[PDB]
């Protein structure tokens, strides 16, 4: 390559914590490398973040006597030269951990497409953030209410099952009082046994009506609960994507920047 300066490297980021590296190296193909500095705050630390096999792997770079290298012996004059060589090779000289090649840098330059152009973007953030929480707040209320109603038909189902057997208890015992109490008829209690029979039979009509009413009363908000999930997921990626808008607007400035809004 060339004797190019260390600070202005394409792959290099300075004073970047572990969590920024972890969130930047997400859903990333194999062979992606990233060079940063350790949080131990000694000079010439230069941790390298190679992501292989779905998880990031940290490789230390040493600075012994002005030379660089992952391990003894050290024979690299410049860490830029070291990374260029390891982009040329595929980690063959080291332990054969799949021998991946440094292929995809995390470039801060290959992206995109002073106080005046920041107030307009802050105003639109708050209005949509509350709506997503508004959908979620009644998402919990409907879901809990559905479960309270889901068990209600089950509660009605037992009462129907109890009463349906109860009318059968009369019917299996209906045959014994067919004639011996109808011998009298007019003043005998047979005028009451059907009068007792229609009392309970009218009662089970209301319960099966209330159960039938509740059968479709449950599905009205269930589709609405289905529609709320449709409406909530139709706005979910926008909340995630509008969060990343700070990535391209906190550079070139770093005062009361955190206070102006």
């Amino acid at each position: 390559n060339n004797n190019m300066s260390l600070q202005d490297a394409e792959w290099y980021w300075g004073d970047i914590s572990r969590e920024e590296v972890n969130e930047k190296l997400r859903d990333t193909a194999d062979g992606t490398f990233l060079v940063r500095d350790a949080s131990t705050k000694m000079h010439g630390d230069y941790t390298l973040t190679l992501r292989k096999g779905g998880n990031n792997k940290l490789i230390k770079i040493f600075h012994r006597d002005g030379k660089y290298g992952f391990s003894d012996p050290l024979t690299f004059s410049s860490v830029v030269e070291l990374i260029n060589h390891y982009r040329n090779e595929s980690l063959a000289q080291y332990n054969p951990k799949l021998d991946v090649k440094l292929l995809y840098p995390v470039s801060k330059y290959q992206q995109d497409q002073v106080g005046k152009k920041l107030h307009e973007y802050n105003t639109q953030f708050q209005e949509k953030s509350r709506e997503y929480d508004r959908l979620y707040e009644e998402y919990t209320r409907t879901s809990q209410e559905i479960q309270m109603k889901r068990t209600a038909i089950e509660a009605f189902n037992e009462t129907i099952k109890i009463f349906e057997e109860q009318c059968q208890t009369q019917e299996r015992y209906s045959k014994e009082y067919i004639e011996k109490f109808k011998r009298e008829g007019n003043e005998k209690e047979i005028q009451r046994i059907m009068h007792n029979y229609d009392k309970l039979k009218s009662r089970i009509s209301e319960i099966i009506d209330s159960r039938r009413r509740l059968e479709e009363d449950l599905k009205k908000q269930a589709a609405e609960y289905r529609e709320i999930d449709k409406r909530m997921n139709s706005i979910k990626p926008d909340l995630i994507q509008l969060r990343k808008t700070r990535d391209q607007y906190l550079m070139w400035l770093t005062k009361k920047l955190n206070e102006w809004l």
Binding site: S39, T47, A155, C167, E171, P237, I240
Partner: protein, 1011 residues
Amino acid sequence: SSGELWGIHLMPPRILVECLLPNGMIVTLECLREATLITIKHELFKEARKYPLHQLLQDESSYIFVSVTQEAEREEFFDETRRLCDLRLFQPFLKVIEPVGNREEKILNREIGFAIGMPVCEFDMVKDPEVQDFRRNILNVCKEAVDLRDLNSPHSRAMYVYPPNVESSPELPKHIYNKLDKGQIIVVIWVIVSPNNDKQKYTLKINHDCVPEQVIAEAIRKKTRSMLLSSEQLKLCVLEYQGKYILKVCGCDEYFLEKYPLSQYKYIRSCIMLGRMPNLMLMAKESLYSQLPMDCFTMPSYSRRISNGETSTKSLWVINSALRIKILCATYVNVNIRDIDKIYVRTGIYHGGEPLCDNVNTQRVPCSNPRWNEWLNYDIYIPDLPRAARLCLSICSVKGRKGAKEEHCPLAWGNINLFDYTDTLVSGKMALNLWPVPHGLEDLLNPIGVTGSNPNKETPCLELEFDWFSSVVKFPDMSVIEEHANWSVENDKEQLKAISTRDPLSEITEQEKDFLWSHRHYCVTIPEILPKLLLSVKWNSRDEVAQMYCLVKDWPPIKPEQAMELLDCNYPDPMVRGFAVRCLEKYLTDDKLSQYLIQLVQVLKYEQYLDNLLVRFLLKKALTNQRIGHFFFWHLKSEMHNKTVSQRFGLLLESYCRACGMYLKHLNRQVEAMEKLINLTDILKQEKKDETQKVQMKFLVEQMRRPDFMDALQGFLSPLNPAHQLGNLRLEECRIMSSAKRPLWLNWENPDIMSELLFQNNEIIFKNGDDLRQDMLTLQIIRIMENIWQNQGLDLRMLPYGCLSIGDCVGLIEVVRNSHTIMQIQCKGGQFNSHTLHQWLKDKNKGEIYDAAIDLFTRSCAGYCVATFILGIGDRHNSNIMVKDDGQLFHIDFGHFLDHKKKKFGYKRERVPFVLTQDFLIVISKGAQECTKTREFERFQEMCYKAYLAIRQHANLFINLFSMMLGSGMPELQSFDDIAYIRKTLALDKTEQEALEYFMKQMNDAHHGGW
């Protein structure tokens, strides 16, 4: 009748209850709320002969009622003493079907279901063999604990009911050793309290290391000296009275049953620390033995069910094929058609948190046709699969428009254990009900979440087809692994120590991992290096996992607070977690177990099987200690609203309540009282948002004038502290606050006979709608840091008051004596001068106790400044700080214990929430025009620096505790990036000298002092 699911809140004058009859008729009877089932039966059979077919009627007590409750379950109401209100009736009807089974077992089942919060018939009606196997096999440890409870009865039963509250270490810190006259304590003994009214107090000058046997010996030798002078043989005849007396904490239910040094008891140590006189009392041991109830435990009905086989399975290490999983189809995905373009299924094999292979995705398909039928291929061999491997997968949607930059978002996630609990590899067709994506989650997959299908059937479901290898495949036995073991065949001592000294969350490099694995045999010399060694090994191999199993088999035990880290989400292996459980069994005391009971409960979710060693250890400890068991039940009950952990916590609660003994009565009384309070708060909340405090006051006094609420809100142990008894409810002090979220202040009375010298009124704030879990975690951290400071030699005593969550966004908060908020401080007596707080403390107390109040104020300020800076608790306003009259202050509202404000209003806050206000400077400096150059402020700086250094030295424990609480579900504790805040504030990466420099720079930035 109440519940308000399909009915209404029960306030009828007289409630109509319909009645059936076995011959086939119906009876209408109007009755009252207070009527019992026998009372119902009286008017039922009064009109039974009036109705026809009276000859088919049997005897009065010949059969039993049955009806339908609000839980959609049929309840055979065997208990005839129940009133008409508490029946939880869903429909006002009654039926009789005659008894068919054992009355006592179904009474016990009803009690267990009520204490749990849902009927156990749900646990009966499940087709999963794992649930039934767990319910069958946990009764072994239940029976073992019950048998242990009666080894030397009645002593063991007393130890179970009233376990001794003992300090963890018998050693006594130096800062409280100098508070004793020649190492002796003065105790006051109350004796022979009786209807004879011969109450006596005796002051005993006894040493700190004495035993309760010596205490009663001194008490009887001081009591007998007044009634008789004795002839030097009469006094020697007291050898028959040492077995007849048991100490008790006066005004509390804490007995000194075990033979311990007196200064090791927490009550005596607290009395020494705060300076109060330790006031004890004596009683006959026969009274204590007679007052405790008979402990019974009978095997349940679902046991004794023990009375498929082909080629005796096959070992998994003989397979020579890769891993294939077929994604068949999703029944529905609930996403918009025109807006969101395409969906796909993203899967991946995981072990804990780290993947064992690259994640693979199916081809993107439109929402209209969610059918894939694609064989996903993973680059992991079948024998390379570890025991704790899991398949983590989710249904995701892609938005590839607006110039590329696809917006991959999750719709629903799920995890399948790749191995059954019977060590068998997953095979055949399988259907998974996908779980909803948690709020505020960024990652595409959810490997932190628990396994299993969603019980809810209105959720997306995916059909999984697993490869079939002509027979069921079993994980190899330990003998086969040991056969595969041993088949693989300086200045480095300092490097291993340097690796071991750092926190578990520090950076670990590839060369460090290779060095650790290359020196794995030398790592036995440093037993503390086990977590680093386990992160060093990669589990996607076979021989090295066998080697690590061989190493863990012979690994020496480590500290409980170190092996307790091995139970978090990073280590899912059964062998590693079993080793951690063995260390906990052999090294963790009961008191430290109660210290970390909440985290040990919350790390039960990371377990991949219901039946394992950790749950057996926790249940065996809970069933032999009612103090541990009380908080075990309440911690398991507080998380039962969560459907994702409802099943396993419910089964555990069923086992516990089956074998907890006679504590079911007290737990049921607490459940009844808290349920009535929840109902009252819900009624006052959902209906009276826009009513002035007079309306809520009159409604509350009308609700509490009812006989049932009074009868349910007396005579139950306080859930915050089981020793405290909540007796008579005085309604004069019970009130509603200024309605922050309508908190409920409740005042009770001590029913203890000898309780006038102690507090006679128990105050608990009832808050509904506020998540109290972050407050419990903050107060636990506060307690642990205060204990560390007191052990080190710093008298930085703080106030970690009681706080417990009893359900979904509801809980109890302990209230302290004589505390006023700084809002209330400047509200009265005068636009407030800078000398307000110092003058108020001068007016509250003066003379020779003025200096004690001042230095107590300074020590409390130092402790809480260090605490709130380190933890990064939410911004301490002047309304979250309350100061007592004696001088000590504290903080009350820990809304967010890890800032949780760093994402909004900028990106890097790193703020100090509690800054020393100028009034605080004036009072700390005893009142002066200048504060900074005062030598007292230099002493305050020294206190703060020493406290910060001690917490920095012990930061590993706090990091482990946070990593264990990670999986609970708090919004600000969802990934290790949240624990990165507590890691950065203590400056673990920087060395010891410059970490103090960072602390000094932050504390100067807060105070605007160049220094």
